[PDB]
Amino acid sequence: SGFRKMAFPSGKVEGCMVQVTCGTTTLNGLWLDDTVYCPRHVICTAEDMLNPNYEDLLIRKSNHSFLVQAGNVQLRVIGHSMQNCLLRLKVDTSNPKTPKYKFVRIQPGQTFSVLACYNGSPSGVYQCAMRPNHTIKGSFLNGSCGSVGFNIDYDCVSFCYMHHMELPTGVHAGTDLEGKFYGPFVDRQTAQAAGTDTTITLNVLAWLYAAVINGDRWFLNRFTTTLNDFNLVAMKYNYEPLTQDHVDILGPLSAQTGIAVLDMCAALKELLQNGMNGRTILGSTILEDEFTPFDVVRQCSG
Amino acid sequence: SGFRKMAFPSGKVEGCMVQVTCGTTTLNGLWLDDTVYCPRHVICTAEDMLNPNYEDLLIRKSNHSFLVQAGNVQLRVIGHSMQNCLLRLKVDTSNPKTPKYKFVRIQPGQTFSVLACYNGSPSGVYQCAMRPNHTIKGSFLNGSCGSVGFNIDYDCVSFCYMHHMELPTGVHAGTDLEGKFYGPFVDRQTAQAAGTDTTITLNVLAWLYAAVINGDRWFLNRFTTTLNDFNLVAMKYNYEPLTQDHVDILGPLSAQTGIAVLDMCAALKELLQNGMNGRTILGSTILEDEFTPFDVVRQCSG
Ligand SMILES: *[C@H](CC(=O)OCC)[C@H](C[C@@H]1CCNC1=O)NC(=O)[C@H](CC#C)n1cccc(NC(=O)c2cc(C)on2)c1=O
Numbered sequence A, B: 001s002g003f004r005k006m007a008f009p010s011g012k013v014e015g016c017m018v019q020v021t022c023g024t025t026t027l028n029g030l031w032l033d034d035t036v037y038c039p040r041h042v043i044c045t046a047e048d049m050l051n052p053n054y055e056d057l058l059i060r061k062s063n064h065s066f067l068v069q070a071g072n073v074q075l076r077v078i079g080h081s082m083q084n085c086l087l088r089l090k091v092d093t094s095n096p097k098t099p100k101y102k103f104v105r106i107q108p109g110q111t112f113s114v115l116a117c118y119n120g121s122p123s124g125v126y127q128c129a130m131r132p133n134h135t136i137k138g139s140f141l142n143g144s145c146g147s148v149g150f151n152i153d154y155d156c157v158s159f160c161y162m163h164h165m166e167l168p169t170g171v172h173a174g175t176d177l178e179g180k181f182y183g184p185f186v187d188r189q190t191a192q193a194a195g196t197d198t199t200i201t202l203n204v205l206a207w208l209y210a211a212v213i214n215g216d217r218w219f220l221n222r223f224t225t226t227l228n229d230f231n232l233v234a235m236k237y238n239y240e241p242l243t244q245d246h247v248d249i250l251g252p253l254s255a256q257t258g259i260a261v262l263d264m265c266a267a268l269k270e271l272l273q274n275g276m277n278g279r280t281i282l283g284s285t286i287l288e289d290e291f292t293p294f295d296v297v298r299q300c301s302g
């Protein structure tokens, strides 16, 4: 019945994306009740990037210094504070399109949809995963900062990402909605590097479980193996190692397909060794690891 | 700055997705002003699939025979007609969340976002392209029919797709919002086949133009070639042939990168002949053809 990388619907978040300008510099922010969250680097000038004192740069501002527009209509600011790497700006008006929501801090290999925005307007939406090295392989132009990542859960919106910046390799770094960065990164134009990235092993498996449910069984083999043998191979190929928790978590997809997590791992193990022979799994010629167990069922079961 | 497959934001459409039940059978429909469009096969029973008389099956129904719920609140039906392969159901109430909109009939290789829905609720959103053989490689479970495809253009929503059914290969068929199918397909459980599929040549190019703007130039070469030589190779590899219109259309990305459409085609030509040597373009190990010229700029320029 098909397997696509698919995002959550964006409407609920769309109604929360306001424009924040401070002096000249203009980026997106998130409007939940009478707060507007945006990156603190909104207060920076082109120079205040190599080495900026935020606490200081900010002590040189007031509520009226910041301009917040919903589509075209300004919100009057009445409070402005620093929340780690964000600004928490109080506003005269509380958002009428504010959904049920929570702020969460996703673990690496966990996924979220990004809503890419410019001057407060949403430009598009795509799925991605939080890398082990604590990065994102997003698509983000200049003015994209403030753009958010989120998981929906019925009518509840869980915010997990706000975009701050791009790193050397061409990869993206940002923070939770508590303004606390992901990985060891800082809001400055210094030379910072993402660590070496591993492959999210659990996700790769879930993706085979999905290939199977989608009638794609070629790479299946008879061989089994122990978590122990498999972990030795995983290290070679820079795969994140498998914890029994992970195998328990694949239980539902395991039972659902009548393939034992460890039988599947044996199939993977082989693929890591025996290439793919220019075949395709679900149409991919590489091992997709941006799909959680949860992603897989949700799509393949309701 | 990154290149992702990204959908348009779904909010505008989200507010248009109602549940339509007729007897037992329950699928999604689209609520624009006081009309509800849904597939006509809503009126079918499990048996009325191999060979159903719709005009007849429908002549055996009235306005109250159909149940339309917005989230949970019923819309009173006051008119029910057949619009080719859709139903046009009139309702007591006009939709308060109806956007500016038009109904268009995209050409093959043109793309749209799909909003996958179940019992009137949106489940997720993904980009795809209308294949040359007039199919879609979507992800669609049972109850997904009624789900729509669309292009946004500032605040205007252009509807181009409604989902009717799956075909042998694992591919998806449906219609425009005039109820007129795409390709030679019919709303019946007969054996219908998609033609052989070609590769959307223009899109493959735009995707290299994007790889280039995203600092990915390895596959570039010195060789040029004429539209004529390139078309001969295209046929071999089941690529859709290049019309000068197509090359004119790549003009903006051409100028934008200082690579001449025909210089780029020469690079492609080579790739079709000289594999990829297990390299990646924009991280893909195959030639991506689900990206229009227009898709490419929009993402890489605002
Ligand atoms: C924020 C955009 C925004 O809205 O703010 C301006 C109004 C951007 C997002 C970037 C632009 C390109 N791609 C992105 O993801 N972030 C920045 O530009 C940050 C600002 C902060 C903090 N920033 C500032 C200065 C330099 C850099 N870049 C690098 O450090 C860097 C080094 C290498 C190599 O590649 N990038 C940066 O992200």
Ligand SMILES: *[C@H](CC(=O)OCC)[C@H](C[C@@H]1CCNC1=O)NC(=O)[C@H](CC#C)n1cccc(NC(=O)c2cc(C)on2)c1=O
Pocket (backbone or CB within 6 Å): A001, B025, B026, B027, B028, B041, B049, B140, B141, B142, B143, B144, B145, B146, B164, B165, B166, B167, B168, B169, B172, B186, B187, B188, B189, B190
């Ligand atoms: C519509 C789902 C819906 O909401 O209607 C039921 C309430 C589905 C969408 C399908 C389900 C699985 N994947 C999809 O994209 N469409 C149908 O099930 C249609 C109905 C019509 C018209 N339909 C009916 C009967 C058979 C088939 N399938 C095939 O013809 C077929 C043959 C092979 C091989 O694979 N599929 C069908 O789509």
